[PDB]
Amino acid sequence: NLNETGRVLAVGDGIARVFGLNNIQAEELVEFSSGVKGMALNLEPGQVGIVLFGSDRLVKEGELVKRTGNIVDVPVGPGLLGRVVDALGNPIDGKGPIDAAGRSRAQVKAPGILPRRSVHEPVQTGLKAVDALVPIGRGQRELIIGDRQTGKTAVALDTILNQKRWNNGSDESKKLYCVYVAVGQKRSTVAQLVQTLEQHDAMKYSIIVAATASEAAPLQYLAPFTAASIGEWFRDNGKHALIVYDDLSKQAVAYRQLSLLLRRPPGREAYPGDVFYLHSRLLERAAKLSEKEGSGSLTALPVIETQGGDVSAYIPTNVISITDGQIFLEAELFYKGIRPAINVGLSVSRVGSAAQVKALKQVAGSLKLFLAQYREVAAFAQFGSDLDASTKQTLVRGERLTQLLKQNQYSPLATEEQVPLIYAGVNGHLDGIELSRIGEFESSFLSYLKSNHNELLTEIREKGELSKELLASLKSATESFVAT
Amino acid sequence: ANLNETGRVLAVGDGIARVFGLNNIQAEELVEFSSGVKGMALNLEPGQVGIVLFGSDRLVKEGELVKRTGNIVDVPVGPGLLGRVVDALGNPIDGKGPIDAAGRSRAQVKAPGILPRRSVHEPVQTGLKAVDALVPIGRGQRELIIGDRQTGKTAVALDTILNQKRWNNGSDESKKLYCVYVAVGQKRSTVAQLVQTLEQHDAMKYSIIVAATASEAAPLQYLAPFTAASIGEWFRDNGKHALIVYDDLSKQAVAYRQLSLLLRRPPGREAYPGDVFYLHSRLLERAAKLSEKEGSGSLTALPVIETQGGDVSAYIPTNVISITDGQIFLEAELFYKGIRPAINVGLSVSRVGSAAQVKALKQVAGSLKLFLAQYREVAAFAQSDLDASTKQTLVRGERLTQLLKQNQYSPLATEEQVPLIYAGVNGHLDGIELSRIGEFESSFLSYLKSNHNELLTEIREKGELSKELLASLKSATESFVAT
Amino acid sequence: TPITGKVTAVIGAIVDVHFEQSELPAILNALEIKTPQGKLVLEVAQHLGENTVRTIAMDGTEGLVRGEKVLDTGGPISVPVGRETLGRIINVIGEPIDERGPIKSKLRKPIHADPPSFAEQSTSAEILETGIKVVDLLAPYARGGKIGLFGGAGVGKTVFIQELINNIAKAHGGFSVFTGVGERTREGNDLYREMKETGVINLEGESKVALVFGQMNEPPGARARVALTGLTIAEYFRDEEGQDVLLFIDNIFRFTQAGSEVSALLGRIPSAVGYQPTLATDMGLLQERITTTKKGSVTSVQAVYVPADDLTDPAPATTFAHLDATTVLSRGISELGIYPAVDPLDSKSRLLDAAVVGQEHYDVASKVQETLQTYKSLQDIIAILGMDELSEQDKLTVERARKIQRFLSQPFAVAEVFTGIPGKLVRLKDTVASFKAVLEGKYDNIPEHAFYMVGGIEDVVAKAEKLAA
Amino acid sequence: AAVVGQEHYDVASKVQETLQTYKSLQDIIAILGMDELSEQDKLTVERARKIQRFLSQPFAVAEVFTGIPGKLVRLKDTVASFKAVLEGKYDNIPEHAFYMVGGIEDVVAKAEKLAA
Amino acid sequence: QGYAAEISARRNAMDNASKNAGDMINRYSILYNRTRQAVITNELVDIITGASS
Ligand SMILES: Nc1ncnc2c1ncn2[C@H]1O[C@H](COP(=O)(O)OP(=O)(O)NP(=O)(O)O)[C@H](O)[C@H]1O
Ligand SMILES: Nc1ncnc2c1ncn2[C@H]1O[C@H](COP(=O)(O)OP(=O)(O)NP(=O)(O)O)[C@H](O)[C@H]1O
Ligand SMILES: Nc1ncnc2c1ncn2[C@H]1O[C@H](COP(=O)(O)OP(=O)(O)NP(=O)(O)O)[C@H](O)[C@H]1O
Ligand SMILES: [Mg+2]
Ligand SMILES: [Mg+2]
Ligand SMILES: [Mg+2]
């Protein structure tokens, strides 16, 4: 009966050609007699072409192959929370069987034009630079791009850690569950990470999905899709997830590998012709549903690794134009002390203020444009020709604003801590203070505001909007403190 | 019927011929065709044998009968070869009769491993101040010569082949270094004159030349260095010393790119096949110094890379530098300024000769290297102000480079170099005019040769220096500064 | 009984073997062809279909004849593991090549084995003092971590590693496993001399180290594998005999280069820069094995080569993400005569964190880097306009950076035959203080040259007094 | 000219020459400052910068980004205002007054509003 | 005297600037040709590989 079974013709390099399997579906799962599972991708006339999920030493010519009858799919539901699963959603932590509310497929149509809404909820990262300059919204896709060792993962991590603020509560609709997809990372590096998550009691609301350096190409390529489904459950069921794709550059490396080995002819930099389609259909799966559909969101932070700062290379270019804005990290910025090494100049959030907080919005008026003008005047400064009172003026403020956005890892700030800082900088209360001392200003300021004018800090938080009198109290409060 | 010594061409083109049969054939075995054109068994598949032609395709026809040789690619070897000039198959081409052989080594032999080896220690005297002093070369060491076209790459190599005459003349069996010159991709004209100038200096008697000129077949130009290797290898094996010269590897690599692209292997960087490294690595690994247990024979690779607009960073050069034991980068900008040999110091290095050189010189050239190498970055910051600190140190570095200047075909002996470096780093010559530096070089040796004769004799016997000979020469130096 | 195949095809390093019936040797299995010599090894790369496999030879294929009988050995390449291999020099095929008879171990293990699982992972942040200023201070190595030295040709990865062996390996006690991949046999012959002299290897005594060598003369199959042999040996000392293992690889690049050498003959469409399309995962299988686990610590230094001096070449690019500390050698820096020719701005480590090295060492680092980074930013103006066009604060930073830069250079004992000056070893506490003082300008009044090629801050005041005479 | 008239074509060409000059001089501005310039040049640059800004404009669609109300400009008002700018009949007004505004009305309005 | 000493300096300095940028041009020229060349090959491979399948 060659309808439900095939014999192997040849096997090599993760691939097995197979005579038979007549009833097999495109993208169907097959078990080999030896145990190892595989996926059918090329149903040709004479034969079927299978990528393996395992090693192949164990597969020999003529060995019988078996139909599963299922397209690749994953367990979903809140049972996954806290678990470390592989691409197909098998526990790899050691904590035993996953309990699922059901099963999604790996590839799923993105929600149409019809069942969506405007992004209006903030996804607060607690990162001064990010939450004031490039505010991220519940439903939006936001690229994290830069060279190697620039702090891409760190940004993503510090975002996750922050959600503690809301996840230890009981208001289901303020919560943000995180899904972290590890693609092409080494295992120990995923370990080192799940450790830190626990060190911060952040694992009870996360789901790591791992396709490490050593796993089969198909699993790597697949992980992001499977993961997208895991967190699609949350969006569909009235809740909000956050998906971090760390990182797509590798996913494409692996997807290139399937294709070159399946012998599909290659595109530019040996990538397949539709490497763009690869990412587009994934990233579109992030969205903010309409009231009719449960108002659930899914938010995506893809990561992308460049070389030599070149953003004009194939893959980055692709995703850059797929997402609702990017955060550029730079090595140069880093080593001279800006950390996050965000590039204000190049970073954008296309949602913008729609996903900020009204209070933050109010005092962040024009900051991003100003910071641009600042680089402007600082470029003209290289002429080292005498400055006037206008350029020196904006130079002094831009330098202090720059400095005011620097932030230590693992320290996300509440909005009401962010707000007065920004206000002190913008309205120029920081402008007569030494640059090295702005460090001590920040904490010394907040310390004092908590101690004394806590009644403001608690209004900002509760109300999220600086009323006219609250600006007054804050105005007074800042001047007060600056005089020392 | 008996397709076991024989086969028939199924198809021929692009320098390959697919033969049918030859069932007992072995890989890399030679084959002869109906018109006496030699091929080689590349790959053996079920059904047919891929065979690479050592010649024009015209000399073959589909259908022709093909015979086995039973010989894996191999060459004549041994003492006889000296003073003769052969091609990639040890075929005589000077017309000086038949090659007199001792035996026949394969062109594909493996390298002496971890154990039969011994740290290189005997120097190979090149007679070239800049080299001997700065980047000296021991026997068994593998030193690269990497410059742009027209830089004195052969000059350097040729001059060494010349210098050995001091030693290859006398009774001493261990002081002798025989020369093997491969001429890969060169011109027929160039080789003639290169032989002429080797006979004009008598160095022919002690040297063998293998040449695969730019007309000859790709796999000839490819096989040439390997076959030269075995020829030289004989000496390293029978307890003697040989100096092989690969001129050049860049043209060998290119011949390989040929075959490899005609056999339709994917191109890597600059269209080179992924194994172009293994080509040179597996060749040079044979140049080697042997242990006391294996006769202590030695074979000294002097390969030549040719760069392109001065490019060290190129994919071939890197590969060869990452194989060899250092390199003598000859920079054109210096050579255009009349500096000869134009050795860039901060880019040339001997890796294993700084422990094989001659004592006498090392004593008298304390740090001379980075002196001049950091002298170059200084004088290139002058074109500022009068600074009698680094201005003073300038009067040296100029008289010093003026001192390295060597006219071609001028091999100096060690004892002759030591006194010049003496006066160099001791600054006995600063008061002598800049255009009387090299002129004095002749005047000074005239002065030493019939006066302080024993100073030359004792440095020629020991090669060392006591504090005894130090002051004994510090009288012969300032003496001639006055007279 | 024995399973025998027939040689159907020979191409370069590739051999095709046909097997009579059903049971085809598994992929990765060793095959043997009897030679007049000894025997030739082969590794089943793929099943071509129709009872044919395609292998990679572990040695030369000269003289192979179509139809030849090939014996299946029913397992991956095997290697002697455990204490029996200490002070022995070994093959890729796990054989004795030190002219000293059979390595009489108890067990032989496959070279191919799956990398430690995720549950089996084990992390920690313990500094490993090296005595090297640039490292100690800027990118601290970690005990049981993965270290890598990056650089193009002749910048100094080998010599640097010999300095690490010098310090750590002596006062380490536990077992070492040195692996020479695609390097000079000279170097390997030298290292065998070097050990018998320090007494790390004692032919008549005990021994702390082991030697495995697939050098640059080897065929690409040999070199594509020899590192897996080293690894198997180390992995025993780690998991079975629960030991602290020092594992030096040199050079690990030569493994991926070998991979490409064969890749085309294996029938694969090439990838960017002409690399085997499997370059990432073929590294992940190997790298992910060199690791510390809940059963034993492994610290490993690997030498990374950098083709054409391009750091973005797809070989090294992919490496980085496998290391815990990365220290890069610049050609330019060596041409300045600065050694070690480390890049103070490109070198990194997970351990440079206040939680590990402490606020001061942390800050002395950062401040040093800002300084160097500024000098770097100005490289263009100084190149055209020179120093006179810089401001005052800028001007100072440069003179200071140029001092810090020269101070980062350190004489190495092993490299003595290149400096002349007997090598120095500074300590971690020593280095941090020294640099802190310079960053507080407490030495500004000292000629830049004094900072060049000397030990700790004491050696600077010395050399400056010497020169001031 | 056949399509938009000569005046339109001339303004449009001059505006272009201006910015083309200003672009060409950005070498000398970096290296030798603004100091080392011919007086005609100094003015051309002055005028080019003013012109660069007058080419921006708040879109209605993009209010979420500028918080500035969308301004739409009539084609004749465009040409007239650029003509004026070009002949120097506005050399006194500061650079910022041309940035993110509609017609020359808005340049004057902002000029005073800021000076206030 | 000061002015005529300064003019001399400016001349000499500017002269050397020209020598250096002269030598730099030479270097970057060489680097340019390398990059060009490879750009051609890496671009070409992409097609060749694309073409075999
Ligand atoms: N604000 C910060 N302060 C100090 N270190 C930081 C900060 N943010 C990120 N880092 C990290 O910078 C290093 C690595 O950053 P990381 O998040 O790894 O970058 P990356 O893009 O993830 N690295 P990788 O993707 O592996 O090339 C250190 O491991 C971290 O300390
Ligand atoms: N020290 C020297 N003095 C005078 N001429 C020299 C000197 N050294 C080398 N030459 C040569 O300069 C020319 C070329 O030398 P050569 O050995 O050809 O350089 P090259 O790099 O070999 N040239 P080519 O082989 O064609 O790329 C003349 O052939 C020789 O005179
Ligand atoms: N810190 C150092 N001090 C002095 N010499 C050094 C130092 N580091 C490296 N070198 C060497 O730089 C050259 C080669 O060093 P080496 O360790 O060979 O480089 P490399 O990267 O190993 N060479 P290779 O393996 O062929 O790529 C000279 O042999 C030495 O001067
Ligand atoms: Mg990462
Ligand atoms: Mg030549
Ligand atoms: Mg090395």
CSV table of N, CA, C and O in Angstrom, one decimal, chain C residues 1 41 61 65 85 117 134 163 176 183 205 231 270 280 334 437:
chain,number,residue,atom,x,y,z
C,1,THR,N,28.5,-11.1,10.1
C,1,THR,CA,29.8,-11.1,9.4
C,1,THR,C,30.1,-9.8,8.8
C,1,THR,O,29.4,-8.8,8.9
C,41,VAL,N,40.9,5.3,5.5
C,41,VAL,CA,39.6,5.5,6.2
C,41,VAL,C,38.7,6.3,5.3
C,41,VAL,O,39.1,7.1,4.5
C,61,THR,N,43.7,9.6,-1.9
C,61,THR,CA,43.0,8.6,-2.7
C,61,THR,C,43.8,8.1,-3.9
C,61,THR,O,43.3,7.3,-4.7
C,65,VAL,N,41.4,2.0,-7.0
C,65,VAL,CA,41.0,1.4,-8.3
C,65,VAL,C,39.5,1.1,-8.2
C,65,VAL,O,39.0,0.6,-7.2
C,85,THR,N,45.7,8.6,27.3
C,85,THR,CA,46.0,9.4,26.1
C,85,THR,C,46.8,10.6,26.5
C,85,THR,O,47.1,11.5,25.7
C,117,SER,N,22.5,18.7,26.2
C,117,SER,CA,21.2,19.2,26.1
C,117,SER,C,21.0,20.5,26.9
C,117,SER,O,22.0,21.0,27.5
C,134,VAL,N,45.5,43.9,28.7
C,134,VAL,CA,44.4,44.2,27.8
C,134,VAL,C,43.2,43.3,28.2
C,134,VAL,O,42.0,43.8,28.1
C,163,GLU,N,51.1,32.2,25.4
C,163,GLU,CA,51.2,33.0,26.6
C,163,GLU,C,50.1,32.5,27.6
C,163,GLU,O,50.4,32.5,28.8
C,176,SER,N,44.7,19.1,30.3
C,176,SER,CA,44.7,19.9,29.1
C,176,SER,C,44.6,19.1,27.8
C,176,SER,O,45.1,18.0,27.8
C,183,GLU,N,47.3,24.0,11.1
C,183,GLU,CA,48.5,24.9,11.4
C,183,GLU,C,49.8,24.3,10.9
C,183,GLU,O,49.7,23.2,10.3
C,205,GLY,N,57.3,10.1,33.1
C,205,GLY,CA,56.4,10.4,34.3
C,205,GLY,C,55.0,10.4,34.0
C,205,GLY,O,54.5,9.6,33.2
C,231,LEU,N,37.9,17.0,20.7
C,231,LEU,CA,36.7,17.3,21.5
C,231,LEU,C,36.2,16.0,22.3
C,231,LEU,O,36.0,16.1,23.5
C,270,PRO,N,26.7,26.3,-3.9
C,270,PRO,CA,27.4,27.1,-2.9
C,270,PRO,C,26.6,28.3,-2.3
C,270,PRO,O,25.5,28.5,-2.7
C,280,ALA,N,26.8,27.4,9.1
C,280,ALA,CA,26.2,27.7,10.4
C,280,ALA,C,26.0,26.5,11.3
C,280,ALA,O,26.6,26.3,12.3
C,334,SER,N,49.6,45.9,15.2
C,334,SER,CA,50.9,45.2,15.2
C,334,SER,C,51.9,46.0,14.4
C,334,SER,O,53.1,45.9,14.7
C,437,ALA,N,45.3,55.4,37.5
C,437,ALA,CA,46.2,56.5,37.8
C,437,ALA,C,46.5,57.3,36.5
C,437,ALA,O,46.5,58.6,36.6
